[PDB]
Amino acid sequence: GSVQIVYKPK
Amino acid sequence: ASGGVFVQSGGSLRLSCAASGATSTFDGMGWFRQAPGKEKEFVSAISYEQGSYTYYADSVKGRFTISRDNSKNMVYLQMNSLRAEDTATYYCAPAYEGDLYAFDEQGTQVTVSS
């Protein structure tokens, strides 16, 4: 139902 | 009440994360961190497949090294040349194509003193 995403480097 | 690791500037620390292996959903593992009053920051991620991805934040390149041991179902983060700005709580998370996915958190608090 929910997630936290921490994106890789741009 | 607010316990963690303490390291002097220039010192080192190794973190470890259990890494159950690739699923249809996840193809690696990594770390993010969150410093007091700041947003979550990507640190590093590594693929289970040898040679596929090894990502680092620009702020940790050259100092931090991520590795995997698939026989032990573990990943490791070797943090060298620590500096005060590395002070944060560090969190393990599964990765898909390098991006980190967190559900639910805990973490390892690290204080680096200048």
Kindly describe this structure:
The complex is a heterodimer of chains A (10) and B (114). Chain A is mostly beta strands. Chain A is built from no helices and 1 strand. With 114 residues, chain B is mostly beta strands. Chain B has a single domain, classed as Sandwich (Immunoglobulin-like), CATH 2.60.40.10. In chain B, 0% of the residues lie in helices and 51% in strands. Chain B contains no helices and 10 strands. In chain B, strands 1, 3, 4, 5, 8, 9 and 10 form a 7-stranded mixed beta sheet that branches. In chain B, a hairpin with a 4-residue loop joins β6 and β7. The radius of gyration of chain B is 14 Å and the shape is globular. The two termini of chain B are 23 Å apart.
Q: Quickly give the structural class of chain A.
A: mainly beta
Largest interface: A-B, 8 and 18 residues
Q: What share of residues are in beta strands of chain B? A: over 45%
Q: Would you report the number of β strands of chain A?
A: 1
Got a strand count of chain B?
A: 10
PDB class: immune system
Keywords: complex, immune system
Assembly: dimeric
Entry title: VHH Z70 mutant 20 in interaction with PHF6 Tau peptide
